[model samples]
Target: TIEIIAPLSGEIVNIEDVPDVVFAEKIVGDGIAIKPTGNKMVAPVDGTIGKIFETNHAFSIESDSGVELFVHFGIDTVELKGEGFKRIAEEGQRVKVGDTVIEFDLPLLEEKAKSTLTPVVISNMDEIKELIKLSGSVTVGETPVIRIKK
Candidate 1:
């Protein structure tokens, strides 16, 4: 089983709670939405950065077992053009759960972006056997929010 921890210290909400339809509808895949209370985004599992978007607003991390985790920082953040985002991990970099992937400006984002609902998705959900969804608030290194049995 592959366990995904909270990418940031925050609350775990239903994907439907996300503001954007792309995330709210689970268009990319089944996942959880985190209303982060901090500025740094971390890897939810041991993985390689499969695709870190140049805008630093989104990323795709493929776990060793083929589970791709998609993390989008904010709604309509691409328009920011990397303004309030900073990449800490590069594409192809190896990262463990809790490793810093990106750091962002929460205040600047709140002022310019649509929402701060960060969606962490399992893009390749077809390979999993079961998913354990956890709720309530979470702290970094404190909770396993989702578990995927592969």
Candidate 2:
């Protein structure tokens, strides 16, 4: 079993509650969304940075066990053109559960983006046997949000 923690500190929102259809419909994958009250986003698992977008609005961490955690900052923030987002970690770098991956100016993001709801999903759902989802509030790097039984 592999446990995925919260990448940001915020109130947990159901993935279906996300504004975008791609996320809300679980077209990408199934997981929880976070209405982040914090500024920094961290690695949810110990893994290599599988992919960090140039816009710095989204990233994925892939564990050695092959679980890929995809964390997206804000809804439609990619259209912001990386304005309020900052990439602290590089692609291919190894990171622990709490390591800083990306940082954003909350005020700037809220001012320009559609919504500040961040979605954290398991892009590779076919690799898992079962997924245990959690809700409520979460602290960055600490709260276990999803447990995968492979």
Candidate 3:
């Protein structure tokens, strides 16, 4: 079993507790996705860095159990090109639960017209029996922000 932890400490932007659409247009293919609130993002689970997008907008971590968790911060925020944002971990760095993954200046991000729809996705969808999203308002550093049953 693998535990999913908050990637970064920030207010829960979108969790199972909130009503939202999957942003199907943003999905390249199959995977379960979740978005963090505002401009803050964190590592949801502990694992080695798998791949980091050149645009610096999204990253994936491979859990010990072999689950690839994809974390995308905001929709189209990459266009900002490092403006109003800061990345905490580099490629290949080991991150623990609640570590800061990325931080963004929400006010500046908003001015740039970026959607703060942070999505935490399960990219390897074929291995699981069931995926459950925990319900409740989540703040930074809280457990069960997202819970998965394998």
Candidate 4:
């Protein structure tokens, strides 16, 4: 079993409840995706950075249990090229839950006209029996993100 933590410090944006569909493309993977409520991104669990993309839009973290969490911010914001984004943690670094992974200037991102629909995904979907999203509004550093039963 693995506990997925909030990948950023912000209000939980329930993509399932959001009316508009923001995804423009889909990446073939087995991870669960989440949209961030705010512009800041954090480490969802204690793990090693498995991969970081040159696009600066997504990253992968390998948990202690061998679970891989893939996190991507916004839908097509990668085209912005870090215009309003700033990474706080380096690739291959160990991070704990709630640790600041990346932060974006909301206003700047807005000015750049980028979609803020972040996706927190569990790339290694084959290893799990169940993935459950917790109920209620989740605050930064508080509340459970997702419960995984293996």
Candidate 5:
């Protein structure tokens, strides 16, 4: 019965609607993406920190219900080499829906990068029973974006 929340403040976009072909084609897995307008990243679901990328540009959270959500901030931001991004939460830490995990300099990133389009994906989609993505405008930590039936 656990539902996934949007990890950051942005416009909800379907995976197929994203500019990145990987996400658009659901190469990794089917989920949703966001045109991020904010910099603080949070846990989309209550779970242990599965893995936080050393570059601080992306992370994975394993929900208590066993669904893993991958939240990638900005497109190709890993190439930034950790610039304009800061990792606030350590790896393997527990987090709630609104807990700020990382703080990024959004304005700086926007200037250094083309677009800060973030993607929230189901890395373990094969393990889940059903993943329903809701699209439109959604608030991070507030709007329920994915319905996970486990």
Candidate 6:
């Protein structure tokens, strides 16, 4: 069993709670979302930074245990074109859980984006045997919000 820590400080929400259909319907993958209150997003698992999206709106970490965790910041933020976001960790870089990956201007994001709900899902869901979603508020880089059995 391995754990996925919170990438941002905020309220934990089930994947189904995300307003976007791709996330709410679990089309992307099964996992959880965060109603973020923090500006900096950190690595949720130890892995190489797979691909930080060109827009800086999303990034994925590929863990040694075969877990690929994708963290997408805010709904429809890709349209912002990295205006309110900054990438701290480079793609292909190794990072441990809680390492700062990206930072954002929360207030600016709130004004420009649709919603601040961030989804952290297992992109490689076929490899997962079990997934446990935990709820409540969480602090960035420290709290375990999802438990995985693979």
Answer with 4 or 6, whichever has the higher TM-score: 6
Instruction: Write the number of the candidate with greater lDDT, choosing between 2 and 3.
Output: 2
Q: What tens-digit string does per-residue lDDT give for candidate 5 at 1-150? A: 678888888898777877788878888887888888887888888989878888898998888878888888877887898998888897889988888888889889989975688889998878878777787888868998888777
Q: Which wins on TM-score, candidate 1 or candidate 2?
A: 2
Error of 5 at 148 (Å): 1.8
TM-score of each: 0.94, 0.97, 0.76, 0.80, 0.93, 0.97
The local lDDT score (0 to 100) that residue 103 gets in candidate 6 is 90
Give the runs in model 1 whose Cα sits over 4 Å from its true position: none
Local error of candidate 3 at residue 22 (angstroms): 8.0
Q: Write the number of the candidate with greater lDDT, choosing between 3 and 4.
A: 4
Best of the two (1, 2) by lDDT:
2
Candidate 4 structure quality by residue, lDDT tens digits, 15-123 = 4433335322324343334444676677788889767666666788988888788877766776887777777778999988777777777776666644565666676
lDDT of 1 by residue, 64-95 (tens): 87888898887888889999889899899998
What clash pairs does model 1 have?
none
Residue 49 lDDT (model 5): 86
User: How many clashes (backbone atoms < 3 Å, residues ≥3 apart in a chain or on different chains) does model 5 have?
Assistant: 0
Question: Model 2 scores what on Cα lDDT?
Answer: 0.92
Question: Which runs in model 3 stand beyond 4 Å of their true positions?
Answer: 8-39
* Candidate 2: tens digits of C-alpha lDDT, residues 1-150: 899989999999999999899999999999999998888999999989988889999999898889988999998887999998889999999999999999999888988899999999999999989999998899999999889998
Worst 10 residues of 4 by lDDT: 17-26
Q: In model 5, which range of ten residues has the least summed lDDT?
A: 13-22
Model 6, span 85-120: residue lDDT tens: 888999999999889999999999988899889999
Among these predictions, the greatest lDDT belongs to: 2
lDDT of 3 at 15: 33
lDDT of each: 0.85, 0.92, 0.62, 0.67, 0.84, 0.91
Off by over 4 Å in 4: 11-39
Per-residue accuracy of model 3 over 3-102 as CA lDDT, tens digit each = 5665543444533322234444334323334444555566667767766666667788887677778876666766988777777778887876666666
